[PDB]
Design a protein around this ligand. Structure first.
Ligand SMILES: NCc1cncc(Br)c1
Length: 165
């Protein structure tokens, strides 16, 4: 199971780790992808997760979009986890660099409550442009299920832990 995590609350845990490496080791029931509405896994966590699946996540995602159309910002869909997890929960957090409503970050984290345990990144953090300290606060105040957060950047992980109220 999950190891080396620091407990933040009753249900939120955090570790300085590469989420792809964490997914390969653990093979969680659910790995969360930091998706966009088009499921175009080009960069950040999405590009890294997709590259780990040898592009199978993108092929599956393109078929999903061809059938269903784009997701909503704040929404999600459950697809295969391929070689990383049983399932991948593709969650769309608001992209601040695209002028999207930061208030949608709470709606995005609410998707986690449909799963008892998840391996996840901080939503809207990184290339999505939101403040990761704000994302962690929304996570602990929204998610009630067991969430194991993987933060790739060591310096950011340290900042998040040392500033956690
Ligand atoms: N080394 C794979 C990787 C690349 N980029 C971001 C993350 Br998170 C992980």
């Amino acid at each position: 199971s999950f190891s080396g995590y620091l407990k933040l609350t009753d249900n939120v845990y955090i570790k300085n780790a590469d989420i792809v490496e964490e997914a390969k080791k653990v093979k969680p029931t659910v790995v969360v992808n930091a998706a966009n509405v088009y499921l175009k896994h080009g960069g950040g966590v999405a590009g890294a997760l997709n590259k780990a699946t040898n592009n199978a996540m993108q092929v599956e995602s393109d078929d999903y979009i061809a059938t269903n159309g784009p997701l909503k910002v704040g929404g999600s869909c459950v697809l295969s986890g391929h070689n990383l997890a049983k399932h991948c929960l593709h969650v769309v957090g608001p992209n601040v660099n695209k002028g999207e409503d930061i208030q949608l970050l709470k709606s995005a984290y609410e998707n986690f409550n449909q799963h008892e345990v998840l391996l996840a990144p901080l939503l809207s953090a990184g290339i999505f442009g939101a403040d990761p300290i704000h994302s962690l606060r929304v996570c602990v105040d929204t998610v009630r299920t067991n969430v194991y957060l993987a933060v790739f950047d060591k310096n950011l992980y340290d900042k998040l832990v040392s500033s956690f109220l």
